[PDB]
Design a protein around this ligand. Sequence first.
Ligand SMILES: [Ca+2]
Ligand SMILES: [Ca+2]
Ligand SMILES: [Ca+2]
Ligand SMILES: [Ca+2]
Ligand SMILES: [Ca+2]
Ligand SMILES: [Ca+2]
Ligand SMILES: [Ca+2]
Ligand SMILES: [Ca+2]
Ligand SMILES: [Cl-]
Ligand code: NI
Length: 194
Amino acid sequence: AMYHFQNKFVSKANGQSATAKSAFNSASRIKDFKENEFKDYSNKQCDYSEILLPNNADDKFKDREYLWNKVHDVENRKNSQVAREIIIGLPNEFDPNSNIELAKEFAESLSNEGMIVDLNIHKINEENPHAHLLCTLRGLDKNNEFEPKRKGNDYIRDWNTKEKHNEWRKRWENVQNKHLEKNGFSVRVSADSY
DNA sequence: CGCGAACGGAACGTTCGCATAAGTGCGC
Ligand SMILES: [Ca+2]
Ligand SMILES: [Ca+2]
Ligand SMILES: [Ca+2]
Ligand SMILES: [Ca+2]
Ligand SMILES: [Ca+2]
Ligand SMILES: [Ca+2]
Ligand SMILES: [Ca+2]
Ligand SMILES: [Ca+2]
Ligand SMILES: [Cl-]
Ligand code: NI
């Protein structure tokens, strides 16, 4: 019954971590190898967790611990951006089961592009059901290795452009409105303002 | 987006950070 779409970067230049975020959002304990710490946020809340892969991805990446360590490996810089976090507002009139399928579908539209998505749904059965989406900033190659982000000043993927940003905003509107109609609600949602 | 910082390899050529719209039923 409300629109909310946030697109942000997870950067090490601000003391952030992919292992910390994945643990904080999934309410699990994940080991960081390069720092030999244990990111233990298992005392947090999380009602649904899933990792969604693109077509040419190995089943290894469905493990949350391996994934973000493999990512940190490629992001071997002190200012390296490790991931992209997308949080979305879920309609609070939805039951958990239908709220999952809604968030699951939009996440699969991202893995079709094709990123790896760490989907975690927070506080269902509450006033503000939302879903965090940790997405990789690189794609996979023929050898299941991360491709580079950059070639000179140009990008390899179009994931970081305004056109793709505004596309994702409109996509979340359409997907959400579709599920709102399917479950039998007269309520719809919009992305723009003014 | 073009700039300089940050890589790998131990020069300086090359990959990167930077970050979009939108402000609630947010939240330290
Ligand atoms: Ca700061
Ligand atoms: Ca769970
Ligand atoms: Ca409620
Ligand atoms: Ca070095
Ligand atoms: Ca060598
Ligand atoms: Ca010399
Ligand atoms: Ca931009
Ligand atoms: Ca929120
Ligand atoms: Cl939070
Ligand atoms: Ni949350």
